[PDB]
Design a protein around this nucleic acid. Structure first.
Lengths: 50, 141, 120, 46
RNA sequence: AUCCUUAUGCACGGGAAAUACGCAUAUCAGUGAGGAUUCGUCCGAGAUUGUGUUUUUGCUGGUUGAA
């Protein structure tokens, strides 16, 4: 059930290794869950950039 | 409304129903809807009765959800003079409720950056609908 | 858009000075649609001014047509020809944009139509 | 010939204080004329 | 000690523009100026007003005429 924790983990991973696509994918998946349902497109863009 | 049938092919109350039954529908909106119908609405009886039933069910559920949301908003408004008093003072209680409800909580609203706040409660920006105002205010909301 | 009014003494108005950058875009659109329309025969034979007829020529053609209908000048049987002219008054000045947009969306790509509407 | 405004003038005379007269809002150009002048002139600085 | 990134200061050199560049006992401005938008959101630093010059500032050289 825990999603905030997951998000935190993802963030940490990004901080450690930014370019890793799997982390980005995970983040995207998390976003898709629909807590934000926003900052979504921007996040995607960021992922693409990285 | 579209589904309703009976006198719907000529004019029920067709263009009457939109303004009254779907209270939101403004003249401009209605005109475009009509245009769309004239062009792209196939008006052959629904692919199956089952499909129609499903759509009806969806409508019922969706409507209920909307009602619930509205109720929640109302509740928030009633409360917000206690919840987010400063915001209310700045704006007005109903407006505050609308904003806050949209956000989530007050915390959520706070987290929202100021430039975004503007375009909360905006009607989905359609390409076809005119926009430029004498105001110069892009957001409305 | 700025509107310097004209100086046709008998009756003035209007000249719309559009922004130079946008103007290019507008110009291109004008060129393209007109080209495209001509290719695809959007506009009937009856609409004027055509690229072919200079207005005096057009007038001449019209006259010829009027003459060259079957038994038009015969009035033995009580025939009545009637040549109704009229100005479609305020045509441009009461084009509703929503309706216009919709109409365009029949004949152009919707994006273009939208753009046109925005510009107007 | 100046008959329509006389009454108004009289009313004004009756009403106003000295203080009020003193504190008239020295008026701003609502139609932002000087800006316009600056702009056009600049554009057509010959 | 060598090499590099950043900013700035001085300068060689090369280029573009001056319709541009200032100035203010002004008014307001990252506690949001001004903008974008696919409408979800995004960018984020000047804007307003006043005003000075602005087919130009400072300096040189030539021919000439003037006579």
């Amino acid at each position: 059930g825990n999603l905030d924790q997951a998000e935190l983990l993802v963030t940490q991973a990004l901080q450690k290794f930014p370019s890793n696509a799997l982390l980005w994918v995970e983040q995207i998946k998390l976003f898709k869950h629909g807590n934000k349902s926003s900052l979504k497109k921007t996040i995607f863009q960021d992922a693409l950039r990285r | 409304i579209l589904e309703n049938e009976n006198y719907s092919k000529n004019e029920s109350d067709e263009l009457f129903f939109h303004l009254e039954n779907k209270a939101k529908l403004t003249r401009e909106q209605i005109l475009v809807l009509t245009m769309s119908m004239k062009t792209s609405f196939k008006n052959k009886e629904p692919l199956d009765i089952k499909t129609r039933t499903q759509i009806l069910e969806a409508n019922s559920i969706l409507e209920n959800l909307w009602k619930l949301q509205e109720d929640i908003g109302q509740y928030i408004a009633s409360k917000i003079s206690i919840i987010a008093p400063n915001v209310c003072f700045l704006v007005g209680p109903e407006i505050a409720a609308q904003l806050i409800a949209h956000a989530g909580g007050v915390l959520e609203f706070s987290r929202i950056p100021s430039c975004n706040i503007a375009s909360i409660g905006k009607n989905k920006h359609l390409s076809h609908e005119l926009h430029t105002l004498e105001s110069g205010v892009r957001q409305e909301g | 858009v700025d509107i310097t009014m004209m100086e046709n003494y008998q009756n003035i108005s209007p000249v719309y000075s559009v922004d130079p950058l946008e103007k290019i875009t507008d110009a291109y659109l004008d060129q393209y649609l007109w080209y495209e329309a001509d290719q695809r025969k959007l506009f009937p034979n009856w609409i004027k001014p055509s690229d072919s007829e200079i207005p005096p020529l057009l007038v001449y053609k019209w006259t010829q047509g009027i003459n060259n209908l079957s038994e038009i000048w015969d009035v033995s049987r009580g025939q009545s020809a009637v040549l109704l002219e009229t100005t479609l008054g305020e045509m441009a000045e009461k084009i509703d944009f929503t309706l216009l947009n919709r109409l365009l969306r029949l004949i152009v790509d919707p994006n273009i139509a939208d753009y046109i509407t925005a510009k107007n | 010939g100046n008959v329509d405004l006389n009454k108004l003038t009289e009313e004004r005379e009756k009403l106003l204080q000295s203080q009020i007269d003193e504190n008239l809002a020295q008026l701003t150009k609502n139609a932002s004329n000087p800006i316009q002048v600056n702009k056009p002139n600049a554009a057509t600085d010959a």
